[PDB]
Amino acid sequence: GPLGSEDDLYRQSLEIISRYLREQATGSKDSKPLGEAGAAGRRALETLRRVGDGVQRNHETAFQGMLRKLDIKNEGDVKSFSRVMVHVFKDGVTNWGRIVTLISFGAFVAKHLKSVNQESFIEPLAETITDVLVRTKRDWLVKQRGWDGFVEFFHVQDLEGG
């Protein structure tokens, strides 16, 4: 799109992230096997749910804090996330662990968004998250084979214990 063909990786990301938030919003592993994202989407979903939730487990208090600051209510919610998104990557550290954290937070919001019956915004939320991400770090994703490298580096579990 804007620069080259980053939309290829975007297709997967948009769906993979959505599947994660949809699964987190329900709290049940009901999300159907995404075929749109391909095999990488399957591998990523496994990782995304385990690692994404892990981010919440150790610092949920932080997500709860930001959740109360995020003016999520109207369509402006997608702009609200963009506001924090731009600031989160201001120091330039795009390290893989940070991306998973962005999704982690967005999904945490999606969970409460589901309980407040504002699911009409959770759907475009993942889309807003993935779009901005891919348009600003198209090269970054490519460097780690997109979700393929993400899964390879995060599919493994802790070895230290905790």
Binding site: H59, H87, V93, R98, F153
Partner: peptide, 27 residues
Amino acid sequence: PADLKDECAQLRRIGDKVNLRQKLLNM
């Protein structure tokens, strides 16, 4: 509004801590 500075600051650090842990976790 501007108080989001401290909020996003956390999100950044939480992301770094994940990458940090998983990095040594592997190698």
